Structure formats: C-alpha cells, structure tokens
Design goal:
The PDB classes it as lyase. Four copies of one chain form a homotetramer. Chain A is an alpha/beta fold. Chain A has 15 helices and twelve strands. In chain A, about 40% of the residues lie in helices and about 15% in strands. In chain A, helix 3 packs parallel to helix 10, helix 4 packs across helix 9 and helix 13 packs across helix 15. Chains A and B meet through helix 2, helix 4, helix 5, helix 9 and helix 13 of A and helix 2, helix 4, helix 5, helix 9 and helix 13 of B.
Chain lengths: ~400, ~400, ~400, ~400
C-alpha cells in the first residue's frame, strides 16, 4: 500500500524501508561509499541538473540516509526529512538557512545550553539579533516580535524543571505576524508529541537521544515542507555547515528506531512509578514530572502529549552537599550528562556541569543547589527505586 | 621514543597510535559511543572546567578521533588537529571561527566549486565580504588587501588545469599586513606538500580524497596551532557548524592512511607514464600535469612538491562532441566526479557537471569544451593507456 | 553489586557489561583486532601457559565477545558462555567436542533440517551413530539408549507444528544412564524458558533469531559448566570447527539483546491476538500455538514456559493451491524462511522449501499441503489481522 | 571485458567487483542481513531447488562475500572461492569434506601448530589416520602413501626456519597415486606464489595475514574447482563446521586486498635490506630468508616464487637469555604472535609461546633457544635496522 496508511507501530517498523530490489536483502544495505558512477556522459548531466532521479556524492545524498529521512517524515507527519551530523547541526543548518544579516529571532530562555551559546554569541556576530523570553507565558513571545522577526524558537518540555510550552497557541501567534515556528521535539520523540500536527512549521531532533535510543550515535534530523527541506539541503548543508550524517550512523539509527514504540512505553511506565515513589519520600522537597497531577501545567500536558516522558527532576533536602553525597552513593544508576539510553543515567548540575557558575546566576537559570536530573532506563523499576532509596537515606 | 623523531613512513604507520593500555589490542578500538561516565561528582566538575584530562560527549571529543587528529598533526608538522564531517565543514568551521560581520577575505578564483558558493553567497549574507583574484600572480593578492582583511585563502595545485600558487611568497605577503594564510592541501596530501613548513598558518583537507584513499568515507581535517584549534573545537564545532566526525569514520580513515606513502608513490609513477603517453598522441591538443617540463610553473613545482601528483587534465581534438564520445567509449576507467580512489576515475565537465552553464561563461572559468580530467588509480599503467588509446581513436 | 543479584530486566541491560575502565565510554568498545601485544617476553609466556589473565588472538578470545558470553551465561543461569559463527556451529562444536568414533546419540526427530543432515549423514561418516525418536513420548527416548550413548539432543517447542518436550523428565532419564542432555532453546530465548534450571547440562541457541532480534546477524552461543566450556573453546573451536564470532557481530548482538524483554512481551501479546483470530475463522482447519488451551500439551506448556512465544502454524482449507494463493496475496507480511525479526515473516513449506520432496514423505514429516508458518513481528496486530483476513478470503 | 584478461594489479583492484546496478555506488555495499525475501511462492521453490540464481540465507551465501570469493578465485587462477570464519576453518572445512572414517592423509611435519593438533588428535578420533613426514624430501612423501590415502597436505615456505617444498614435484607424486594435493599459501599470498598453476588441486589461506593486511580481521578462503567448492559449501560449511564469514568481515578484507600488490612489494623490499644487515652482524649466528643466496634451497625459491617474502628468522648469540634480553629491549618493533600487518612484529618462541615445552623437544621441532621471528612492516627500513642494532648490542 502506502506506508502513510498503517497504524503508528506498523510505520515505526516499515516506513521508508523495503527489501533491496536487486537481491531481496531484508535489512537496508549499508552504502558506505563516497561516490556514485554514471553509465554515460548524458546521465551525468541529467543528474547534475537535478532533472534525473539519482545520487551524485554522499555529502549531498545516499540510499541508506534517504531511508531514515523518509521514515522520520512519516512519523512526524511532515513532507520531507534531512539527516545531519549532530542535534546542534540540525538547529544551526535550519536557522542559518532561514536568516541573514539584519534579521531577528525570538527564543525561549529555557533551552539546551549549546543552543543558548549559538543564539547569544554566534548569531549576533553575523548580524542576527535574538530576544530571549519565558515561553510558558505566550504574551512575552508577542511583546518581543519586531518587523524583522523571521523565526520563533521553542523546546517542550524544557530543561531542567520540565515546564511546558503551548505549541498550538504559539504557532497562531507567530503566523499572525508572518514568522515560522521551529520546535525541538528531542525530549518526547514523535511517539509522544507531534508539533507539525499542532501548527509548527519545522521540527528538529538530536537522534542521539530517544530516536536512536542505544547511546552509540551522535546525529540529528530536521523535518518540514519539501520546499524548505530542499533549501536546507542544497544550500545550508552543501554551502554553509557541511554537517552530513555518515551512512553507518544512518543504519544504526534505522536499527534503533525499530523499537521506539516499545522502548517509549517502558521508559514512561518506569518513570511514573519512580516519580510516585519520590513524591511520597520525606527527604525529597519537590518532584518535577508531567505525569503527576500537581504539575502546574498538568492539563496542557494531557492535551499535547500522549505519554508523560522518561525524564524526572527532583530536589533533595540539604542543598549542595546532600546532592553531592546522593550522586556518590548510587550503585546501579550511572553518572553522565546524556539522556534517552537503555541504562538509567543521573546528574547533579550544581556540583557537576555548573560548578564554575555563581550560585545566584544558576538560581536565575532554574537550577537550585539540591536539583538532581534522572533519565529513566529499561531496568526493573523496583531495582532503580531500591538504589534511589539507599542513596537518599545515606545522603540525608 | 617520540613519534615526531622517526622517518616519514614510520610516522604514517605509528604516529598518534599505540596498543590499548587495558587489553593490548593492536588495532585502535572503535569507541562507538555517545557518552562517557564519571566515577564521582568531583571528577564530573573537574572535566567540565577543562581542568581534568578526559572525554565528556563525542560531539566534543573521542579516543578514536583523537588518534586520527594527532597522526595528521605530526604529518603536516602542526601543533594540533581537529576532525570534521566533510571537506566543506573543515573550510567553513575554520572561516566562521575566524571572521565576523565587517571582516574581509581575499581568495583565489580557481578553487573547488562548493567552496566558491560558500564565499560568493553565504559569506556576504552574514556581513563578510570576499574579493576573488588570480593567485598565480602574487601582486593581485597584494592589491586586494584592505584594513579589514583577516584571511587569505588558496588551493594548490588548482583545478581544472593544475596551475600552482607560490605558498612561501603568499605567506610573506599576508603576514606583512597582519592576515593569516589558509591552504587547502587536499590534492597533494602531506606526503607530497607541507604548507605549514613554507609559512602557512592553517591547512585543511577533504580526507574523502587521498588521505582515506579508498572511496568509502566523507570527512575533513584542519591542522594548526593549539590556540587556534581550541577555538575551532569549543566554538566553531560546538556552537556554529556542529560538523563532528563519527568514530567509525575516524577508524576507517586511520586504516586507509596506513598505506598513504606506498599509494602516493604508485599514483604518481602511473600518472607520469600516462601523461608522457598523452603528450605524444596526435589527437590530444594539450596536457596539464606538473611533472611535464613544459608546465608553465615547472620550477616552482620542483621546489614546493616532492612528487607531481596523481591528477591529469587534457584536451581532446574536436571539442564538445569528441569529449562526449571519448567518455562513452572507455571500458576500464569509470565515469564519476570524485578523486583519489584506488580505481581510475574520468569526467568531462562541459558535457557533465557544467552542461547548464553557458559556453562563454565556462570558458572564462578555464573549462574548454574538449577538457577531460583523469584521477589515476593503482591498476597496471599499460591497461589504463590501452583503454585511453582505444577510446581516443574512436572519438576522433 | 554482583549482576547475578538484580531482576531479570536489569540483567538484560547490565550483565557482562561495564563502562570502559580506561576512558569511561558507556557503550562496549568494538575491539576489531586480530592480535594483542605483550609488554615483555615474560608476560608472553605467562599468558601462553593460561596462567595469566589476558587475550592472545581473537579466534581464541576478545573483550567484546567476552561481554556477550558473560551476559548470556547470567541469563540462562549457567557458569560460562562461548560465542560462535552460526547456530549450526554452536551445535556442531558442542557434539564434536563430546563425541568420538564408536559413540552414540539419541535425538528428537522433530528438529531443524540442517541439524537433521549433520546427525543423519555427517556423524555416521565419522564413526558416530544416531537414533531418532519422537521426544514427546519419553519412553521412546529410554528404549533407544545404549551402553555407548553419551548425549541426548532435543528442541522445544519443535517445528513445524510446535509440539513440546518435557525437559525435566528427559533430564532425569538421560542422567540415570550417565548421559548429558543438550537443549536447543532458539525458539523461546532465556526470557521465556530456562533449560538449565530444569536439569539440562548444556543449552545452545542461534542468536540469528530472537536474541539478536533485528535480522542482521548470523551467530550462535553455547552455555554450560566452566569445565565443559573450556574444552569446547580450547579444543572444539580452536582445533575442530574454527567457528569463531567476529567482534562486530558480538557488538551488534549485545545491542540487540538490550531490548529482549520488551520485544518478547510484544511478540507474544501480538501472537496470542492473531492465534485467537485464526481459531475463529471458518476457512482455517487447524491452529498450532502453545497459548491456546486446545493445544495437546497445554499444561506442560504452562509449567515450563513463562510466555507462549511469537511463532504460529496454521492450516488453510484447500490444500496446496490454497496455500500458494494465500502467500501470493499478503501485502504487509514478507515471504522469507527466517524468524524472530521485528517484521512479520510468512512461509508455505509445501510450495516453497519442500517442493522437491514427495507428498507422502513431507506428510510423515508433519508438513501437510495447507500448512503455513508465521513469525509475528512488532507491527500493530490489527494491521497484521487485516492483511491475513484479506489474503485468506481471496485464497479460499 | 572479462577481468580474467587484465594485468595482475588491475585484477587486484577490479576483479569480482562492479558498481551497484541499482544506485551506481562505487564501493561494494555491506549487505549486513540474515535473510532474503521472495517475491512469490514460485520464486521461493525455484531458489530452494538451486535452479534459480539468488540468495536464501547468509550462512549459505551473500552478495558482499560473493565478491571476495570471485576476486580470490581470479588471483589464484582457480574456478571458484569459498570464504570462512578463520584460517583454521578453511583447512578443517576442506579436509572434513574430503575424508571419512578409514581414510588416510599424508602431511608435512613443519606446519602451523593449530593445524598440527587438528591432524594429530582430532582426526584420529574420527577414524582418519595421519602420517607426518619431512616434505622437503619428496621421497618421504612417496614412501608414506597407502591405498587409503585421499590427500597430501603441505605449507611453503614453512615455519619457523622458512624451508621450502617443491610444489610441482609433490603434485605429480600425489596424482600418480590418485590423491589430491592441498597447499596452504598464507605466507606468500597469490601475488608471490600460485600453487594451482604448478599442479595443486586446492589452495587455502588465513586472510588474517597478508590478504587482509591490516591486523583487524580473522578469516579464511579456500580456492579450487567448482565441483569441489559446491560440496565444501553445501555440505562442509552447511552441515559440518558452520564456519561462515560475516559480511562486514568480507567488506574489510575486500578493502584491505586493494593494496596487496603495493604492500607485498614494500614488505619484500624492506625484508631483503634487513636480512642483508643481519647477515653482516657479528652477534647473529644464522639468518633464514629465501632471498639470501646462501639459503639451502635458493634456486627452487627462484623458480616457484616471484618475490622472497616479508618474513625473516634469525638466531642471536647467547641462547635463551640473550633472546629474552633482545625482545625486552626493542622500542619500535612490537611483541606479538601474528604476522602480515602494516607494523613490524617480533617474537621469541623459546621464552614466549614454547616456554612450557622441554628443551630437547622444541629442538627436534626446529626451534633453538636463540631463534627470533620477525614480520617486517611498512615503516622506514632504516628505522627498523636502527631499533634492531640497538637491541642486539644491549642483548649481547
């Protein structure tokens, strides 16, 4: 049929893929090649004028990476996809394709840090100005728009305390004033949230996280309309960042994404159990998780997301020293700064990533001294709860 | 000892590599990982302040890719290396790290086309102006410099007719006026030409070509001083292009580069034989190759390069139709647009890549109707000559 | 702690694995090496006398493949593991290590065909005789034992009609007469059945099927006591079959097995729904599935297996021509002879694999003209049922 | 044309390979798949009766590994090839396919040790007897043949002292009495020696050594007539050893073998220089190398081999303690037991591999206390000579 017609789990498995026409191989072959041969001089010009269907060099396009791009276009309900070297490269290829000297961007403040440096330092050095706002208050977005504004940029849920942004409302706003809305959907995956279906124009992900899911690939993807994707490919990728994905990396992420549905169901079932345990514990002051009915935006969460996610933040009694003790006493959870792997990962920003930042500066950035972030994996939830209970008790 | 002390062939083999300290594995392991675990909260902050020796996430750095970077630093005689997703990404990470709105660049006109689009369209859209000149005349370089000029950019040899640029003379010029010189050494590899030893500040390569050598990796490398490489890594890569190399790609290129010396000796021995054959053939009007004593810059070539290279251009009698016939009649050489593989590759720009460009426009770009470009491989030179003789005879 | 202490899902994730001691890499590195270097002459003899802990050459042992072997030892509750090139190599390395000229084997008749050729042709040519029996009747096993009998060999469930063998009862029998029991657990995986816990001495699997799960690796594993595994390694592998697993293949199977629990739960949930649909359909004469209470050995199944599996056989009304029509009319299920992949696979032995065998010969081998075998995947069960209903209706 | 018509270097590059018909990809794709899909029930039976051209499962055959097999068939001038998991598996698949209970084998004594255990212990346990002789004296081969003799087995050159066997003379002998001759050509590669052209029936190699050449693959190949290769595939591989090669391993060895000609020329040029240096050194008692005119079989070497190889053995003054000191004092050569890598490898059997064997037993096995074996790599020969001179001087 057409893969766009089956159920969502059937699409995760089949979309963008078929048996190799030449041999019947069921697995997508790894086309680990730099160049592609023509059968005549005429076929050579046909392709080079983009008139012919074909490949020319991998930096431009490849059969392996084309399969991954078509799969993720189906899952997010967009026209076309484009793969990239990193999550960062997906966001920069995007915004450097759209913007030029004299343009303006409105951005959420609560976004990924490497993204925050690109927007606050690199963009202004090329003539592109950025205003940062609290995107949980849609009126702040409206008040910062200018006649020069080309793009509005948001993430949801947002780190470190998992606050939300009302995608449908923000899209309407940006579009009223002739801007595009760009959403980073890395935290949720297309299994749990679909920003294009709520009005967004372009969606980006680090596949490094849940879409791959196995902790062994650095990569990104951009999904949107065909006429935007063509410019992102033939200008942004080709003539600006040079951030292409390797064919082996595309094959590993096609392999990881086959299990996306069954991994997201288990991540989210395990995280709800662990968040209820932490909510009842007398040494934990706060628990930030969208699935708990005390979250300040619980009802928006219930309309916009099909599940509440695999990430939890929480605050331990006793501040900086207590969080340092808790982290040093886990024996099953692993200390690391990534997320979305099959193993449970834990980190304590105040004593780890943000140790050089000044207390009152982190504080205005949402990061208290006792805040711990947990990426819940696929282990038995009992075992994770037991490791947490033991480390909390010691710490406190 | 110190790898910087052995002969050049010994360095190609050993530099940047050692047996795995943990197991004795002779091959560099493939660290195909997205993240790295800390043993305590304290080790986590140590590394994050860059105080500690270690890895954090692969986008930033990885043990596999660190080996490739250290090897190529040794071979070019530079302080440090930085690997990247493509040849394009090496050049863009470089120039976007150095330049900002209001700066100026002086560039050769005879450069790789994707590089020509980045410089003529993308840079001016960010506030960075570029002047193009004929770099074989060092006076044109001098006359275009301005008080705003940060960088001079050259390739040598240059495509499509293999003209040269006097690296030592151009370095002196740029430095007199306080600019940096950036050289693309893709065509020669560090086995045949060493731009840092002649005065250049930074060297870039597509490893896609000879450094890998096997037609199965898209990649780049930048070599320079440690204080420039640190900024290219922690700002250009991390916060601008996001163009990191995958660890599998770094491992394949470490494997390919082991044979660089013996491949470059054979490429260059085969190309001199084939260029002498073509020079004596009555249906060939011109032969462009640095090893023929009739090349207009033969003596500069003899001082700056240790061998004359594996690439040849040549013009066939009868213009456009004759070149189309010749290309369609080879049976051993393959039609393709890359170079530096183990197989011999042939292309005819006028009927292939540049068919949509207007005759008189290509002409001013050095490309006549009869020009063919040949990348000589590792086959028996007799067999390649026989395939050429047969196709020329038919065509003409 | 000790991985042998956590819950089963925690073990699937963590057992046999840890962060790389040298770098902190979370993913097991790929040690794609043929040899290992010594630091002195003395360390060289230490290892060669097996006194020292270390590696020597990969055919013998490797850090990547050692991780997979230790994981699967934990999951089956055995002392040690040994990886191999194929499912076949696991069974042959096993039985050629145990047996010699003049020995005897008692085997089930209902086993995998390539195994049936090794036992009926290759073994007798080396002096080793084999008696085949119906292993669902434990008295037939007892009546075939001889004073020379070293090994009893069984599979359960068994193909093509999914009959069972009572592992606990057969172990007791073999042991009473001083033989070992060897069980092929390929169909169930250690998530659903644990033969060593019921009395078996040695368990073998093709990892090609569910343990890998992704249709991209050919491989096997043998699990047992350390003193048997040492002989299988240093004699059977080293001096008889030479069937070692590559380190890349071990890394892909470690990656696939991370999801084993969540894949087996979904395979088995989807297969029960599809088997109930087929049981109610008027054009299907029989349905063979252990989860249906009409299976002749339902209660044994309920004691020995934790779930009923992802495989179903069934007979369509109208014999040979009807089965050929049904197979040619599916549009989502794929025609192929493997099983345990993420995609649903279908086959019709009478018109496909066994077309050259004589009707009455196949018949005595359990294979009727209308028998179809289905390997249920991870797609939406509604979509699979709809594709079956459509193809059955046409066929019939 | 037909690849069988070009020169030898052209064949190393091109034979068995072509651009992918479906996409034009120049590199052979990696078909990393376990199964292959049929388009109808009829195509399924066609292939299963071996009537149709196609693949079924990788254990049996694969497009990647088929390319490697066809290349090596061309290079050795045989009809067909068959790839395998290890060098050992190539030899065992071979001899277990040919022989059965009651048969006899005549073998050289001076062969690889793992091969010596298979022949002296495993074969007699299956009813197959073996007589060992000194194959440098063709009369000993003749005197051991019996009416039961099916196969004669030789290696040349032979380890540890590089003595030779006259292939043409031994073939004539075996054939006079109706046996097959099987030659292990691992030490030479098909670039330097071609046993099928001198009368041998079957040739085997470990590709682990020179054919791969890069120290990162364990593998083997068997080359012979099509009717022998078919039985080795459909019976020996399928029903006896199960020793198939993975498709990634076949792709790495296709990539390594592209440089075989240029690597063997440099290995052999470097080894002749190093063997002349050692021949003139007053602390070295003997030098075994086929290229020195004092080798006892120099003239046979000059007729049978096109170059003299990359391996050297030599004896240091002072016996066991002197060899232990020399090995512990090299700083560029690496201590290891493999050979044929791009790095120079050294070993001292008496203090390393054979430390547990009794002095007088090793002695009868050709191994004196002072014997060192050197595998010469691709480094600068000056650097290797300097490292040897320094270590010899200290030792002595």
């Amino acid at each position: 049929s057409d893969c766009r017609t089956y159920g969502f789990n059937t699409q995760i498995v089949h979309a963008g893929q078929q048996p190799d026409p030449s041999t019947g191989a069921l697995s997508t072959p790894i086309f680990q090649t730099s160049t592609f041969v023509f059968d005549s001089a005429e076929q050579g010009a046909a392709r080079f004028a983009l008139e012919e269907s074909g490949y020319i060099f991998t930096r431009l396009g490849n059969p392996t990476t084309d399969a991954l791009e078509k799969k993720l276009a189906v899952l997010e309900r967009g026209e076309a996809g484009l793969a990239t070297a990193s999550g960062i490269s997906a966001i920069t290829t995007t915004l450097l394709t759209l913007c030029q000297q004299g343009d303006h961007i409105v951005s959420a403040s609560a976004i990924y840090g490497c993204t925050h440096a690109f927007l606050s330092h690199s963009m202004p050095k090329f003539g592109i100005n950025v205003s940062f706002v609290d995107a949980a208050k849609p009126e702040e977005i409206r008040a910062a728009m200018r006649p020069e504004t080309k793009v509005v940029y948001i993430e949801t849920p947002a780190n470190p305390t998992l606050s939300l942004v009302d995608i449908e409302t923000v899209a309407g706003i940006a579009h009223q004033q002739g801007a595009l809305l760009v959403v980073d959907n890395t935290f949720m995956s297309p299994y749990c949230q679909q920003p294009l279906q709520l009005g967004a124009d372009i969606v980006v992900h680090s596949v490094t996280k849940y879409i791959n899911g196995h902790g062994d690939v650095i990569g990104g993807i951009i999904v949107g309309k065909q006429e935007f994707i063509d410019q992102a490919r033939f200008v942004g990728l080709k003539d600006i960042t040079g951030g292409c994905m390797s064919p082996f990396n595309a094959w590993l992420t096609l392999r990881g994404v086959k299990t996306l549905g069954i991994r997201m169901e288990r991540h989210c079932e395990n995280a709800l159990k662990i968040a209820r345990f932490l909510e009842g514990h007398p040494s934990i002051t706060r628990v930030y998780y969208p699935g708990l009915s005390s979250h300040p935006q619980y009802e928006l969460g219930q309309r916009q997301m099909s599940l509440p996610g695999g990430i939890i933040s929480f605050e331990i009694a006793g501040g900086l020293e207590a969080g340092r003790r808790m982290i040093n006493s886990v024996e099953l959870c692993l200390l690391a700064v990534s997320l979305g792997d099959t193993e449970t990962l834990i980190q304590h920003p105040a004593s780890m990533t943000h140790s050089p930042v000044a207390p009152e500066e982190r504080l205005k950035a949402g990061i208290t001294d006792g805040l711990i972030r947990l990426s819940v994996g696929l282990e038995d939830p009992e075992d994770i709860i037991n490791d947490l209970e033991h480390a909390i008790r010691k710490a406190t």
